[PDB]
Design a protein around this ligand. Structure first.
Ligand SMILES: CCCCCCCCCCCC(=O)OC[C@H](COP(=O)(O)OCC[N+](C)(C)C)OC(=O)CCCCCCCCCCC
Ligand SMILES: CCCCCCCCCCCC(=O)OC[C@H](COP(=O)(O)OCC[N+](C)(C)C)OC(=O)CCCCCCCCCCC
Ligand SMILES: CCCCCCCCCCCC(=O)OC[C@H](COP(=O)(O)OCC[N+](C)(C)C)OC(=O)CCCCCCCCCCC
Ligand SMILES: CCCCCCCCCCCC(=O)OC[C@H](COP(=O)(O)OCC[N+](C)(C)C)OC(=O)CCCCCCCCCCC
Ligand SMILES: CCCCCCCCCCCC(=O)OC[C@H](COP(=O)(O)OCC[N+](C)(C)C)OC(=O)CCCCCCCCCCC
Ligand SMILES: CCCCCCCCCCCC(=O)OC[C@H](COP(=O)(O)OCC[N+](C)(C)C)OC(=O)CCCCCCCCCCC
Ligand SMILES: CCCCCCCCCCCC(=O)OC[C@H](COP(=O)(O)OCC[N+](C)(C)C)OC(=O)CCCCCCCCCCC
Ligand SMILES: CCCCCCCCCCCC(=O)OC[C@H](COP(=O)(O)OCC[N+](C)(C)C)OC(=O)CCCCCCCCCCC
Ligand SMILES: CCCCCCCCCCCC(=O)OC[C@H](COP(=O)(O)OCC[N+](C)(C)C)OC(=O)CCCCCCCCCCC
Ligand SMILES: CCCCCCCCCCCC(=O)OC[C@H](COP(=O)(O)OCC[N+](C)(C)C)OC(=O)CCCCCCCCCCC
Ligand SMILES: CCCCCCCCCC(=O)OC[C@H](COP(=O)(O)OCC[N+](C)(C)C)OC(=O)CCCCCCCCC
Ligand SMILES: CCCCCCCCCC(=O)OC[C@H](COP(=O)(O)OCC[N+](C)(C)C)OC(=O)CCCCCCCCC
Ligand SMILES: CCCCCCCCCC(=O)OC[C@H](COP(=O)(O)OCC[N+](C)(C)C)OC(=O)CCCCCCCCC
Ligand SMILES: CCCCCCCCCC(=O)OC[C@H](COP(=O)(O)OCC[N+](C)(C)C)OC(=O)CCCCCCCCC
Ligand SMILES: CCCCCC(=O)OC[C@H](COP(=O)(O)OCC[N+](C)(C)C)OC(=O)CCCCC
Ligand SMILES: CCCCCC(=O)OC[C@H](COP(=O)(O)OCC[N+](C)(C)C)OC(=O)CCCCC
Ligand SMILES: [Cu+2]
Ligand SMILES: [Cu+2]
Ligand SMILES: [Cu+2]
Ligand SMILES: [Cu+2]
Ligand SMILES: [Cu+2]
Lengths: 382, 236, 241, 123, 51, 236, 52
């Protein structure tokens, strides 16, 4: 819900999410919905965005309607910020536990240290039940299973209310006597030296001594109870394991790419050269959270959002199977309503009219190769 | 008479209107209020922005113009009882202004803090930005300027001279409204993260300091009370 | 003037109540906006309340208004609760917002988004002010008290949240688990300026050294803001602004 | 000149220096970009230059060689991940108007000192 | 590198995406001069009114 | 008599000399003036630096010494007509000083801006640095100090007391000359790029502010005019 | 490996070995982009003749 506002070229070339799969679409309270997939950190990272040297894998939901139970990059839990390498491909697995009923647009966002949020595709996930049914039990190392929803709430309320009561008593002690104009006039007309006198100073000593003793005694009690405490855990996790993808056997060179203004279509020309020994067919073009699919080549079975999917939005001029070793030039047109719904057409307003995306070439046997494309995006007005 | 039940209305109008605004933003914060480009968001919140701006400009003009047209020219001929009644009415104006300061600079300000701290910013006119920057800020600006005009045109103490501390109290919190530009120039530019202690926010901090001028304001109002309604009784 | 002395007293009481309202709520607005735009992030969440940055920064930026308000109130009325009224105003605003916006509008748990406790510092500042009315002595000793009693003052509240837990293979405190679970869409982990450990951190001294640095900077900020408040107390009349 | 004229007219009308610093400074900050828009508008026409989109001003800067001024020194709008909608120019204009208010307030008093007629007998 | 000829012979034609071949050497120069001179004239009139 | 044709000469000497200097730098900016280590550059521009420095020091000494030796000791015995004539001569001195300020701080300063913005800096004594820092800056420094000495030694108003604003006007633009060290310490050190808005240049900016003291200077000169040459006619 | 354990004045003691810079470098510590190989002794009780 955070997207459609960011720069179009920036959404096009920061991070490419693909192979996204949501475990559930209609979850109940306490039931677990898991988001998996792979995200590829783009090589041509925008310079205005700091490199993902300190990046935290987040999830974009309105408030904590889902608690993030687990989140992995590679194969290891990453509860803190991590370092990502530009050009590498990582796979993630975010485990979410439902907490609040309703229709929630759960996005998979990524936060970079000095570059802001990179919201990925989001899927409407419905939750049924009641919030009061939510249970979040966690077992500490000292041997106490505590529910995070209400743990320490009573102690917090008691201490805050006690200190507020002490402050209110301290204020009211002077509020009993007349406050502003009489005291102002006593101070103005000569020495006052009667507005503060015994036993007011004795009450002041009482308040100060009571405050010091109360703080010290409470600290000592909070050291006897809870005798084992550790500092807040922090620190970027370096050395994320990136996916060891095979080198693609298809090389795509983009010879100019245009989009009509105003319009919903993207025109782009490629010179596909297929290596190896299989006939490839261009089947999908993922540019920025939007998948333009070729119905004749690939059909989506992963439950991608309808507003982010172009089932037949990708039209290739010459989509016959491409024999190995052969190179050919085709006119690829990705036209869909999402191109203007998600304001992909406002790249004209951006200070860098350059695009990036993923092309998915599929073979007859069904296996695919993911190839990258990036080229300047020249608007067309005539 | 003296202090009438205008104080109850002054507090109650703010309380009722701001509770209704809180209900409105709690109903339309999500689901027509999450996405800034949906057709329903323009009908539920862009309309909020336009109606509230038009109404606030009209109300500011009408209130200031009325309070300046009905100004008391013959301030010398002022009985001490009427002067004390006007002092109490000015103190009611200050109470209303303080209530507006609270509602604008604490409640809706930290509501915007929660809003943009738990979602991703989508525009310059998010629901909570509309509620805080363009509703509550102009409301207390209007009330502060109205209290200024009332004090200057009715109170013999505050007339014959523009009060420096009370001018600061009326203007500093006003400068927070043009400081909204730095807020947006900050998040879009220098602070590309939802950090809420970063220097882009020091603009409100500097003019949050200028609201400390209520100290001089209230000692000046006490001095104004201590001319005719001096008593006596105090100091004897 | 007034009819009788009794009516004068009643009028003075009414004025005192209304002006107390004005002071309280103008401070509630201005002090709260100042704090939240200078220390809000460490105050919003429980996994931000570390031992270096939180206790370093909070007293420094929170002695600002109490110093000025004390400078005005003590000097003009011999009323030693300027710091206390500022602190309770900030706490009231923060708690109202936590309950009705953090937990009401959104649904962040209170044990996760609770504010910091400041009344011990306020009480020390006010008592060390009225006792030994010397403003310099206040800035020297009460500011040490304000800086030093912040972390022990909040220790009873955040102590249960620092209990070690092993969370799917990683050690985490309760506050870390709350911050990890409850999703803050706009606040990732890396924005957290917390104690991340240093190669110069000798022994167990992160909290006390930070507390003493905060006390010293509180001395300096109190000295500056006493005079800043001395100007705001002015009763001048520019004839031609 | 538009900013100067706004500043001077809002000064003489309502001789209040505070009102000038509050309103004329907004005018000065806000009318800068619309004031220069007629001149730089023709220079922002899109052009495709050997495969890359460029405005006329970009082509001039690329062609006319500035030996001492490379492209990277250019602090210009490079786009952000926090730039929402079409608001770069208006938000910058309002920030400039606000900071113009502050700088006007500071420099009014700085000029008040430079207007002094003091005579130090022993500098 | 030696260059022979005259500077006035230099031609820098560029074709925009809107369909206008403009010479960068003189493009927008007239509009720039006119607007700057108009604003300067307004300022000079404003000063001379009090002069 | 009163204001004589000394004003025409005062403007014309600066105009002619500075047009000749501009022609000189436009002829020898390139081609003996591009490379700082060529044998011809030392003969065309290192000689410029030495001759101009020697001549400027000699001229400053001679002018200040003459204006201080010929000072009027009997200032009490001064007819109002002669006092007004001296006031006009001082105003001619100020006009010459202002012309020198313009030529030094705008024309040659932005000429150096163009120079180092369109070439690579080769030394501390480039052609435009020689023209601006070591010629125009000392020229207006000399003229400002000469005008100071003339006003103090002739004008009864400016005598018996060193004028603070006029001292600031004479000294601040003078401090720009020693600030040239920060300019070079900036480009060689902290600013390794031809950025012309970077803080290494704020040294001239701070003392460019000190030239605002002409405001107090001119109100003081008006007061000096309004003693003997008061009229009257004005204020009646 | 330390060449000597009981050295005399002017006699040379040499420290050799291998150091491996850890992959998971802590983020709070700046990367060893500018690192100087030193020796930790109380004052200059040994002069560092050579270091490779
Ligand atoms: C200092 C001067 C301040 C001036 C500020 C003016 C702000 C007005 C509010 C704009 C809201 C909006 O969004 O625009 C107008 C909204 C759009 O909602 P709708 O889609 O029509 O739904 C139907 C409306 N409900 C959802 C509220 C039921 O409708 C309206 O007409 C309702 C506006 C009512 C405002 C008056 C009641 C305030 C509380 C009572 C105590 C005073
Ligand atoms: C007390 C202060 C009250 C101020 C009220 C504002 C009056 C607006 C007048 C018309 C301007 C216009 O029409 O301009 C709009 C343009 C939009 O820019 P664009 O979409 O990029 O392109 C141009 C598109 N056109 C050619 C169709 C216009 O510029 C702006 O961004 C200015 C609008 C934001 C103003 C926010 C003010 C908030 C005030 C809060 C206190 C009540
Ligand atoms: C007379 C005195 C008035 C001076 C004030 C003028 C405004 C200064 C504009 C800076 C532009 C610049 O100089 O450069 C712009 C630099 C270039 O950085 P970048 O490479 O794009 O970094 C990329 C990082 N992003 C993507 C987040 C941008 O962005 C900055 O770091 C902005 C620094 C903040 C300066 C503004 C502080 C305002 C103070 C407000 C407190 C009340
Ligand atoms: C007007 C001045 C009044 C002074 C009142 C002092 C009350 C007692 C404090 C006990 C602190 C504690 O228990 O030890 C230090 C701990 C931090 O320890 P940690 O390393 O984080 O370990 C955490 C695990 N614990 C809880 C088991 C230790 O707390 C603090 O950060 C407070 C630091 C400042 C204390 C200043 C005391 C010295 C006298 C100062 C005045 C001259
Ligand atoms: C003029 C100023 C004189 C001040 C004298 C100090 C009195 C100390 C009172 C007892 C405090 C206490 O017992 O607290 C000690 C804790 C230690 O913390 P810890 O080891 O992390 O854990 C807590 C461990 N317990 C639970 C066992 C305590 O806190 C501190 O670090 C404060 C001690 C450092 C104070 C340095 C003062 C230097 C003064 C120099 C000028 C003479
Ligand atoms: C006459 C009374 C009624 C009008 C009052 C003004 C209301 C706003 C009008 C917006 C027009 C427009 O063009 O929108 C605004 C355009 C955006 O561009 P967009 O393409 O519209 O994006 C669609 C965005 N939505 C869907 C949310 C509308 O720029 C801006 O973000 C301007 C941002 C300015 C921020 C600083 C303001 C500081 C004010 C200080 C006061 C003292
Ligand atoms: C004393 C105060 C006087 C105010 C006078 C306002 C004149 C009209 C401005 C139209 C701007 C425009 O057309 O829209 C905004 C554009 C920028 O748009 P862009 O996103 O870069 O798109 C570029 C493409 N265009 C040209 C097709 C849009 O210009 C600006 O940067 C000006 C921003 C500030 C405008 C403030 C208007 C709101 C009222 C302010 C006073 C309360
Ligand atoms: C406040 C006190 C200011 C003092 C500043 C003195 C600077 C003098 C200039 C040094 C130039 C240089 O480079 O050095 C000396 C140059 C070196 O040139 P050349 O190779 O001999 O070529 C032959 C000379 N042409 C190329 C100029 C034809 O020759 C000279 O003798 C000529 C210097 C003439 C200066 C006097 C005329 C000024 C214009 C008329 C109105 C006053
Ligand atoms: C007595 C009257 C005549 C002499 C007047 C002085 C003219 C310059 C003499 C240079 C001698 C030399 O040695 O050159 C200068 C040596 C360079 O070394 P180089 O090996 O010579 O390089 C050859 C370089 N060329 C070929 C260009 C000559 O250092 C420097 O860059 C000194 C730089 C100082 C910069 C800051 C000055 C601020 C002045 C402030 C005044 C208030
Ligand atoms: C009593 C108060 C007076 C203090 C002033 C003393 C001068 C400070 C000298 C700094 C040396 C230092 O501290 O370090 C030197 C650092 C080391 O950086 P580096 O690693 O070499 O960077 C390499 C980048 N180069 C290659 C470009 C150098 O260079 C600096 O960044 C210089 C910072 C500028 C400081 C000077 C500002 C002067 C203000 C002028 C405005 C009127
Ligand atoms: C949404 C817009 C609401 C605007 C409400 C304005 C109410 C009318 C203001 C006004 O004139 O004052 C009302 C009262 C009583 O003072 P009055 O006696 O009416 O003032 C005139 C004095 N005179 C008889 C000697 C000539 O004085 C007060 O103290 C009134 C405070 C009421 C709350 C102010 C709310 C302001 C919101 C912008
Ligand atoms: C953010 C910084 C905090 C702001 C505090 C700065 C206040 C500066 C004091 C000041 O404003 O001086 C007023 C004079 C005009 O004087 P006069 O109007 O002649 O008043 C006569 C008595 N007096 C000279 C002592 C004022 O100078 C003037 O020209 C009038 C300008 C008044 C503007 C003050 C309002 C400040 C609101 C922000
Ligand atoms: C960059 C900052 C801008 C500069 C503005 C600062 C001006 C400071 C005011 C000042 O200079 O005070 C002068 C006194 C000497 O006093 P006296 O010579 O006794 O003059 C008697 C009258 N007076 C005391 C009011 C001056 O103090 C002295 O000791 C004499 C020093 C005078 C130096 C001022 C010249 C400034 C030129 C840059
Ligand atoms: C390159 C060096 C050229 C130096 C030119 C210096 C000219 C001689 C200066 C001088 O004494 O003043 C000339 C005129 C008229 O004033 P005089 O009446 O000559 O001043 C003496 C007054 N007294 C008769 C009562 C004893 O007063 C003026 O206003 C003269 C302004 C002429 C332009 C100044 C150029 C300065 C360049 C460094
Ligand atoms: C001194 C400031 C008081 C702020 C109280 C507030 O924000 O109230 C809204 C909140 C909303 O929660 P709730 O009461 O459950 O009603 C929900 C209705 N909406 C969602 C529209 C706010 O609770 C109330 O309405 C209680 C009434 C308090 C009167 C001083
Ligand atoms: C108010 C400042 C006037 C500055 C004018 C200037 O720099 O003139 C040099 C420039 C040189 O260009 P140009 O006239 O073509 O003659 C070239 C001669 N050089 C190359 C030596 C400058 O044009 C003129 O000489 C015109 C005369 C204006 C008299 C106020
Ligand atoms: Cu969404
Ligand atoms: Cu990628
Ligand atoms: Cu902000
Ligand atoms: Cu420079
Ligand atoms: Cu290792």
């Amino acid at each position: 819900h955070g997207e459609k506002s960011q720069a179009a070229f920036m959404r096009m070339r920061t991070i490419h999410w693909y192979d996204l799969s949501w475990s559930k679409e209609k979850v109940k309270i306490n039931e677990t919905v898991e988001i998996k997939g792979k995200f590829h950190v783009f090589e041509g990272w925008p310079e205005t965005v700091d490199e993902p040297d300190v990046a935290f894998l987040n999830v974009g939901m309105p408030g904590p309607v889902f608690i993030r139970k687990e989140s992995y990059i590679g194969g290891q839990l990453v509860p803190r910020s991590v370092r990502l390498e530009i050009g590498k491909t990582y796979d993630f697995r975010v485990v979410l536990k439902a907490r609040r009923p309703g229709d929630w647009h759960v996005h998979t966002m990524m936060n970079v240290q000095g570059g802001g949020p990179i919201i990925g595709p989001g899927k409407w996930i419905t939750v049924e039940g009641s919030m009061s049914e939510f249970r979040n039990p966690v077992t500490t190392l000292t041997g106490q299973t505590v529910d995070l929803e209400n743990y320490n709430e009573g102690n917090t309320y008691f201490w805050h209310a006690f200190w507020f009561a002490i402050g209110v008593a301290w204020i009211g002690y002077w509020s009993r006597r007349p406050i502003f104009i009489p005291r102002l006039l006593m101070v103005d007309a000569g020495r006052a030296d009667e507005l503060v006198s015994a036993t007011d100073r004795k009450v002041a000593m009482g308040f100060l001594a009571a405050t010091i003793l109360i703080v010290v005694m409470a600290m000592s009690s909070a050291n006897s109870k809870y005798p084992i405490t550790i500092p807040l855990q922090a620190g970027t996790m370096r050395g994320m394991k990136p996916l060891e993808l095979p080198a693609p056997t298809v090389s795509v060179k983009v010879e100019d790419a245009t989009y009509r203004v105003p319009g919903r279509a993207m025109r782009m020309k490629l010179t596909i050269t297929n290596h190896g020994n299989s006939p490839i067919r261009l089947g999908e073009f993922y540019t920025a959270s939007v998948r333009f699919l070729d119905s004749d080549v690939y059909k989506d079975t992963t439950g991608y959002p309808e507003d982010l999917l172009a089932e037949d939005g990708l039209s290739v001029s010459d989509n016959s199977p491409l024999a190995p070793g052969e190179t050919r030039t085709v006119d690829v047109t990705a036209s869909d309503a999402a191109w203007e719904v998600y304001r992909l057409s406002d790249i004209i307003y951006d200070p860098d009219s350059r695009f990036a995306g993923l092309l998915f070439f599929f073979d007859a046997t069904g296996n695919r190769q993911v190839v990258q494309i990036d080229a300047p995006l020249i608007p067309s007005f005539m | 008479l003296l202090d009438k039940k205008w104080l109850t209305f002054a507090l109650a109008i703010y309380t009722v209107f701001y509770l209704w605004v809180r209900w409105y933003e709690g109903v339309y914060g999500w689901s027509a209020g999450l996405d800034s480009f949906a057709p329903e968001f323009e009908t539920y919140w862009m309309n909020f922005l336009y109606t509230e701006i038009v109404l606030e400009i009209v109300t500011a003009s009408i209130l200031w113009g009325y309070l300046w047209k009905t100004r008391d020219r013959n301030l010398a001929a002022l009985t001490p009882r009427e002067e004390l009644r006007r002092n109490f009415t000015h103190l009611v104006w200050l109470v209303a202004y303080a209530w507006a300061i609270y509602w604008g600079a604490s409640y809706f300000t930290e509501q915007d803090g929660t809003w943009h701290q738990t979602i991703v910013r989508d525009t310059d006119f998010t629901p909570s930005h509309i509620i805080e920057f363009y509703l509550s800020y102009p409301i207390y600006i209007i009330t502060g300027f109205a209290a200024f005009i009332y004090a200057k045109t009715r109170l013999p103490f505050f007339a014959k001279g523009i009060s420096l501390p009370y001018l600061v109290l009326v203007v500093g919190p006003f400068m927070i409204l043009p400081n909204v530009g730095l807020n947006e120039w900050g998040h879009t530019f220098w602070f590309m993260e939802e950090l809420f202690v970063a220097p882009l926010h020091y603009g409100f901090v500097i003019f949050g300091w200028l609201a400390l001028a209520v100290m001089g304001t209230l000692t000046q109002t006490f001095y104004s009370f201590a001319q005719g309604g001096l008593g006596q009784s105090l100091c004897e | 003037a007034v009819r009788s002395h009794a009516e004068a007293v009643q009028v003075s009481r009414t004025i005192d109540w209304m002006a107390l309202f004005v002071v309280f709520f103008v401070i509630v607005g201005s002090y709260h906006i100042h704090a939240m735009l200078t220390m809000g992030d460490w105050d919003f969440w429980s996994d931000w309340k570390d031992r270096r940055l939180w206790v370093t920064v909070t007293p420094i930026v929170l002695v600002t208004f109490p110093a000025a308000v004390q400078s005005y109130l003590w000097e003009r009325y011999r009323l030693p609760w300027g710091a206390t009224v500022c602190v309770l105003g900030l706490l009231l605003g923060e708690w109202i917002n936590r309950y009705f916006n953090f937990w009401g509008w959104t649904y962040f748990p209170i044990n996760f988004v609770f504010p910091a406790s400041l009344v011990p510092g306020a009480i020390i500042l006010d008592t060390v002010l009225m006792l030994s009315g010397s403003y310099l002595f206040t800035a020297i000793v009460g500011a040490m008290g304000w800086g030093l009693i912040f972390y022990p003052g909040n220790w009873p509240i955040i102590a249960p949240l620092h209990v070690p837990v092993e969370y799917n293979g990683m050690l985490m405190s309760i506050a870390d688990i709350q911050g990890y679970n409850y999703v803050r869409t706009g606040t990732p982990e890396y924005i957290r300026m917390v104690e991340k450990g240093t190669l110069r951190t000798f022994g167990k001294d992160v909290a006390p050294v930070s507390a003493f640095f905060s006390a010293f900077m509180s001395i300096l900020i109190y000295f500056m803001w006493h005079f800043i408040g001395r100007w705001f107390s002015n009763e001048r009349f520019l004839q031609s602004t």
